[PDB]
Amino acid sequence: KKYSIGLAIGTNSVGWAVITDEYKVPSKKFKVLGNTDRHSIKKNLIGALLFDSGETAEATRLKRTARRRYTRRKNRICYLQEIFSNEMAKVDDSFFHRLEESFLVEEDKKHERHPIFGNIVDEVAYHEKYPTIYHLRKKLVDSTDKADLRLIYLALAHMIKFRGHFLIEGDLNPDNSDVDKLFIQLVQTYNQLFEENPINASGVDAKAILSARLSKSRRLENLIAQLPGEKKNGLFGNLIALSLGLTPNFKSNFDLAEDAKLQLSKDTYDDDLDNLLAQIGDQYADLFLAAKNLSDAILLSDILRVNTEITKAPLSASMIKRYDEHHQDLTLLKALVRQQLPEKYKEIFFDQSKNGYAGYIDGGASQEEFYKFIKPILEKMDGTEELLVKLNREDLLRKQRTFDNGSIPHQIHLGELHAILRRQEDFYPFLKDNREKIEKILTFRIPYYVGPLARGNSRFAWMTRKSEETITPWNFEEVVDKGASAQSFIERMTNFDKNLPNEKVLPKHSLLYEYFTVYNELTKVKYVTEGMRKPAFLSGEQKKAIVDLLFKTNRKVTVKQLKEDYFKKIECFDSVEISGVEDRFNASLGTYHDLLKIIKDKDFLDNEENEDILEDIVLTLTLFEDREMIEERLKTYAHLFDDKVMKQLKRRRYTGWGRLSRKLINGIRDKQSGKTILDFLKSDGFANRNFMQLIHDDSLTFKEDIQKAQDSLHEHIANLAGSPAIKKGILQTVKVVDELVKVMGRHKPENIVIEMARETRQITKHVAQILDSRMNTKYDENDKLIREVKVITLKSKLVSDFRKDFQFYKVREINNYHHAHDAYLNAVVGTALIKKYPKLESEFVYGFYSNIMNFFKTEITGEIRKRPLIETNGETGEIVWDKGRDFATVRKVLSMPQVNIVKKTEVQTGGFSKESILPKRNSDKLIARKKDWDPKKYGGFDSPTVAYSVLVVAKVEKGKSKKLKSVKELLGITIMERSSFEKNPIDFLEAKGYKEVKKDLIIKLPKYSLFELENGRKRMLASAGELQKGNELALPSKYVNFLYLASHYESPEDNEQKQLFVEQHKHYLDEIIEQISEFSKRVILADANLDKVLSAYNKHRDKPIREQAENIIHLFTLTNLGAPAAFKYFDTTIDRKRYTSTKEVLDATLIHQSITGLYETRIDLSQLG
RNA sequence: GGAUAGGAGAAGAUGAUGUAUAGUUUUAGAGCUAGAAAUAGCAAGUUAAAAUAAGGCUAGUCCGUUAUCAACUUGAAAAAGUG
DNA sequence: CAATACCATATTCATCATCTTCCCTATC
DNA sequence: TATGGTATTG
Ligand SMILES: [K+]
Ligand SMILES: [K+]
Ligand SMILES: [K+]
Ligand SMILES: [K+]
Ligand SMILES: [K+]
Ligand SMILES: [K+]
Ligand SMILES: [K+]
Ligand SMILES: [K+]
Ligand SMILES: [Mg+2]
Ligand SMILES: [Mg+2]
Known part of the structure; x- marks a missing residue:
């Protein structure tokens, strides 16, 4: 009994088929468990598993970080309140209590309903004097009078709770006082650098035009319109655009060779400016310098729409x-x-x-x-006027809490908070003593490279503590090890050397790594001349000279330079033929030239004894992004360089990591030669062996050491590289294969042909590797793997063209059988291909081309060359295809109505309910957002998700007498209820009101659980209160091909013959309808919808056959497996007819299906009660 | 074929951390004048507190929406066994 | 109880790390 | 999206 397995792997389906030598699908009897009269059932060995898509981790991570932010905001407010505590107690012993319960109804309030002062008169007075919190903030910034402590707290709290972003580094100190004067000074610098061509800036209101509450481009255009002879792309126009925050290109202004785009927001403005001035001249610096000064006075004009002189807020x-x-x-x-x-x-x-x-x-x-x-x-209306201007400027009837407040930096809130503290510390001593603590509550962030401040119970944390104590904003630098934490932040994500698995890869910009790459490229270069007989390799001294003269003097090295600056200047050659490198060398020494420009010491970089220093430096520049930490780490080497060199090193950073460790490049040495890999790359006599040759040479000890240096299924699949949905498909494919192998008496198949839905793709290779390593586990006498199972991979186009050439058409909308059919055709075609051309194994098996599929056909075109009926193998003489019976076998298989389509049942997970917080309502559907918040008073959530339903058989009290009445019903256990239910099901059900629960009759029913009722009608569990359609419509293949040809009516004469087939079989339409109708009246039970469908088909029966076939394809939505869905027949819309009751399946037959659906347990539920 | 190292630009897939702004909900921001009332006329509106998965114990300025799941038997589980 | 219509949190910045494909060089 | 929850209307 030999067999092969075909697999079609998708993101929502795994189709499978079992074929024999004759390309037939076997049919077995499978035992049926349960309590029904049926003891066995016939099953064809073909089907498809259907499943909901796997989800990425993104939404979960986003909600996780939002949770963290809410927790830390609350802790900020708690810090501030604990600072205010005792003095507030002396002022108002219940102020914080009124703040805490502000949300409660007056009935539930334990204190007075007026939060701030506790009496209505004072509260009305406050709201009249301070209609918004910003009135109070400005008053507390500007006034010298002692203020009530509660207003002080409210202002500081509004600032700390909504503190603004942290995108700008350093301090701001806003000042819009002299925008006009700074503009005039910039004009002065411009006219001094260009005395012949000045700029007449008199009468130009730059203040109103650069703070016009319009786009940067708009204000630039407006300020240029006030300047005749000056354009926005001119030098002064680009300078103004730079001051406004744009990215102008000063290339054409100075007739530069290449671009010079400057932006004051990037971290590289100093570097770009210095490079442009090195190209043009330092005397233009005062130009850009002036452009920065003005920029400061404009740096905040869009947020601060008021004069900075009249107020400090x-x-x-x-x-x-x-x-x-x-x-x-x-x-x-x-x-x-x-x-x-x-x-x-x-x-x-x-x-x-x-x-x-x-x-x-x-x-x-x-x-x-x-x-x-x-x-x-x-x-x-009229008289509106300026209202429309304010509207189009988006500044009409504005609230103060708006979406654009994201622009506000935290330095502004910090300035107002510092001003309030400075004002009120004159009267309250604790405010003076805790001023910096409060400012720190506002300013302190957790660094991104620190992560959660956990203590051994967070799978997300990596932080290390210098001391065992609670972390506060004020002791963070003393309790947390920022350095070790940042190093862990980077290192926990970087790869180890695959050759030396206990070694970390070097930084991609390490000097050693770049030397390695340059020498690995240079060692395989050959040069020929006239007097030379054959191309010779570069010797060690020649390679050293090329590295010293070209790679250490030019960032990139071209072949022209190689020939003219070395072979002519040194070797005295006028013509040389180079091989191994095209146009330019790929590798380069960029880090070398960067450090040479920074430190300006070539002997320092060329001295090999300065190696381990520079490495660490590069490491520090790669490991760390925080400039303060980079400075702290590089301080060790401050004795080697100047202050300017150290600052230039500070401003220099790198990202990226190589793929090899330092111990592989320069570390391990060959036993007999004592040379490392880089030593061989520098000089290897005349062999000039590169990296792979060295680490693959049996005469060297590198391969030996690499060999000496060298999980579960779910783990292994989770660690692959790919989308989570396709990983779900892969795991399900492997489980399907295990089940199919078990079905065949634990005998392994001859072939497994896999096709991945949309082959050099890496993920299909991963599937093939997993299957091959699971099937083939034995070795032969030569200690080589025994490949009992050939794992073939095919691309979808092979079987697609097979279908379209032999008229085995698929229509995805008819049902789900097309997945299983694809699996079957994959099995057939793959086995036939490897039986016909065995030499193709190295191409298709794990471990001329335009005509490769021609042996299936009999007449092939302009060839028009015939082929025999019986196609066999050339050498083995074995029959691979019989065109008189194997096509009929395929057609018979694709017409079998019994295909095992299985919808994977899954417990629902995720959010408890819809997120919308609904207003108070008189409904038991509302869910409390907090334990004590009765939704009738406070509102809450509705629409919870059912994790799974539970069949309950028990008694419930009925009437005032509380008479016990036997019931049997489906109870939806919500996601939020699940842990409580599973901790104690009997007590949960009793608290729900159920009495005398038959605990052994409790059936857990996840979503998509299958029930059979009368006449083979099937229903799937959508929830505790709704069902989905559970039957597949096995339409005959004749109608399938007719619909295919009638829909895509739009080139051989076979197109004319297909049109003739369509026109001769128009009646099929009616038959198709009839089929559908019968199916509907048997399993769908949508009377009104079926009648609307019949009427709409009778109306448009006079339509072209093409559109009618397309709309019948649409009509197939009524019968499709799964959740009901609306559809459209011509201009008629048929709304979904849902199954809003799960009562009938309480007396139906529950079907537990294995993964393939071949193994079934059928439970007659009418017997329970 | 498959695999490895490197290069130019692009085009995607995934995982983590640290932030910000809104939204919503209840309460607070004295509504007034005629009216028995139903109601009508007017005044007013921009702000704040608090929650933002119920909650958990491990009590951290931590964790709570990903992955994984037919039935039966054995299992904490992973998983194995049953036709 | 069924037919039916409505509803569903959103946008935003910063720092990393890993993998893939396309085209070239050199290899096992 | 789409499809399961919910109130509305008979
Ligand atoms: K009260
Ligand atoms: K102009
Ligand atoms: K608001
Ligand atoms: K090249
Ligand atoms: K860095
Ligand atoms: K899940
Ligand atoms: K609104
Ligand atoms: K199942
Ligand atoms: Mg909470
Ligand atoms: Mg708000």
Whole structure:
């Protein structure tokens, strides 16, 4: 009994088939377990496993980090409150308690309902004096009077809780006082560098034009329009664009050779500026220098829309400006609406459902929706004027808590907080003593290279502590080892040397690694001349000279330079033929030239004794990104260089890691020669062996040491490189193969032909390697692997062309059988191919081409050369194909109605429910967001996810008498309930109200559990209260091919014959419909939908056959396995008819399917109760 | 064929960490005038606190949405055995 | 109870690391 | 997306 296995691997399906030598699919009897009358069942050995897609880890990680951020924000507020504690207690012993319970209803409140002061009069007074928190912030920044401690806390808390971003490094110190003067000074520098061509900047209001609350490009265009003879692409135009934050290119301004794009935000502005000035001249520096000065005064103009001189709180003042303009424009708009149209005042200022002002404030209308709503009403009326300008500038009726506040840096909030602390520390001593602590609460971040501040219970953490104590914002630098933590941050993700697995790879920019690459390329270079008979290899001295004269004087080395600067200047050759390198050498010594420019000491870089130093330096520049840590680490070598050299080293960083370790490049040495790999690359006599040759040479001891230096299925698949969905498909494929092998009496197949859905692809090679290493586990006498099973991989186009050439067409919309059919055809074609041309094994088996598939055909074209009926192997003489019976066998297999389509049952995981926080409602569907927040008072969640249902057989109390009535029903265990239910199912069910639960009759039913009812009708579990369609529609292959040909009506005469087949078999349409109808009336039970379908088909029966076939393909949605879905027949829409009740499957037959569906356990549920 | 090291640009796949802004929910921000009331007229609106998976024990400024899952027997589990 | 329509958190920056493919050089 | 939860309307 010999057999082969065909596999079609997809992201949502694994199709499988078993074929024999005659390319037939066997049919067996399988035992049926359970309690029904059926003891066995006939099964064809072909099918497909269907499953929901595997998900990436992204959403989980995002929610994880959001959780962390909420926790740490709460801890910031707790730090600030603990600082204020005792003095607040002396002022108001329940202030923080009122803040904590602000969310509670007055019934549940333990203190007075007014948070700040505890009485209504003072609260109304506060809100009247300070209508927004920014009024209080500005007052506390600017006033010299002692303030109530509660307002001080509220201001500091608003700043710390919403502290702004950390994208800008250093300090800011805002100052918009002299934008005009800095612009005039930039014009002065320009006119001094170009005395013949000045710029007349008189009458140019640069202040209003560069802080015009418009795009950087718009303000640039406007400032250039005020300058005749000057264009935006000119030198001054590009300088202005640089001051505005754009990225101008100063190449054409200075007639440069290459680009010189400058941006003040990049970390490389100093380097780019110094390079441009080295190209053009340092006397232009005061130009860009001036451009930076002005830039500072503009660096924050979009956020601080107020003068910095009248207040030390520019941001709160800009918010107050927003508020005042909102108030004034609202009064104006109210008056204008009242006057113009008395109607629509209700719609605009009272209807929360509309995107008017009511929906903008009270409803769910965003600023953009409200703008779209009011723009036509504003244009219709008159007197609007500046309102439309504010609207198109997006500065009309603005709130203070908006989406664009993401622009606000944390330095601005820090400035206002520092000002408030400076003001109020004169009256409160604890504020003076804890000023820096509070500023630190605002400023402190956890470094990205530190990670969670865990203590041995986080699989995500790598941080190391210098001392065992709680980490606070104030002791972080003393308790946390920032250096070791950053090193762990990088190293825990970098690869070890695959040759020496206990060795880390070098930095990609290591000087040693670059020497290795340069010498590995140079050692295989050959040069020929006239007097030479054959190409000779470069000797050690020649390679050293080329490295010293070309690679250590030019970053890149060209073949022209190799021939003219060495072979002519040194060897006195006028013509030389080079081989091994095209145009230019790929390897180079970039790190060498970088360090040579930085330190300006060639003898330092050429001295081999300075090797281990430089390496570490490069390592430090690769290991670390934080410039402070780089400075601290490089301080050890500050005795070798100057202060300027050390600063240039600080500003130099690298990223990237090589693939080989230092102990492999320069470390291990051959036993008899004492030379390392780099030593052989520098000089190997006349052999000039490169890296692979050296580590593959049996006459050397490198291969021996590499050999001396040298998991579970789920682990191994999880560690592969690929999308998680395809990894799911791979694991399911392996499990299907294990089951199929077990079905064949533990006998292994001859061939496994795999095809991966969309072969040199690496993931298909991984599948093939896993299968090959699992099937072939024995060795022969020569200690070589015995390949009992040939693992062939085929690309989808082979079987696709096979189908389209022999008319075995697929229609994916008809059912899911096409996956199993693909697996079968893969098995057939792969086995036939390797039986016909065995020499192709090295190409297809793990471990002329345009006509490779022609042996299947009988007539082949312009050849028109015939072929025999019986195709055999040339040498073995074995029959591989009988065109008189094997095509009929394939056609018979593709027509079998019984195919094992199995939907993988899966417990649902993930979020508990929909995330929307719903308002309070009188419904038991609402879920409390906190233990004590009764959703009838506070709202909450609805729509939870059912992890799996449970069949319960028990009694429930009925009526006021609480009479016990026997029940049997499906209970949905939600994801949030799951741990509680599994910890104690009886107590969970009793708390749900169930009494006398038959614990042994409890059946766990995950999603997609299968039930059979009458007439073979099947249903799958979608939830505890909804079902999906469970039957496949096995349509005859004649209708399949007819639909294929009628749909894609649009080139041999066979196209004309296919059109003739379509026109002769138009009646098939009706038959198809009839088939569907029967299927429906047997398994779908969608009366109204089936009637709408019949009527729509009768209406468009006069349509072209092509469109009718396409719309019947659409109609197949009604019968498809799985969840119901709406579809469209011509212009008629058929909505999904759902199965909103799971009551019938309580008396049906539950079917537990194995992975292939061949092994079944059938439980008659009507017997329970 | 497969594999390895390197190079130019691109085009994708994946994993982790540290941040920010909103949104939503309840409460607070005295609504007024006629009306018994139903209701009508007007005034007003921009802000804040708190929660942001219920929660957990390991109690950390940590963890809580990925992967993995037919039934039966054995298993903590992974997984193995049953036709 | 069934037919039916509505609903579903979003956007944003910074630092890394790993893998793949395409085309070249040199190899096992 | 799409498909399972929910309220609405009979
Ligand atoms: K109370
Ligand atoms: K101009
Ligand atoms: K709104
Ligand atoms: K808000
Ligand atoms: K090259
Ligand atoms: K770095
Ligand atoms: K899952
Ligand atoms: K199953
Ligand atoms: Mg929490
Ligand atoms: Mg908010």
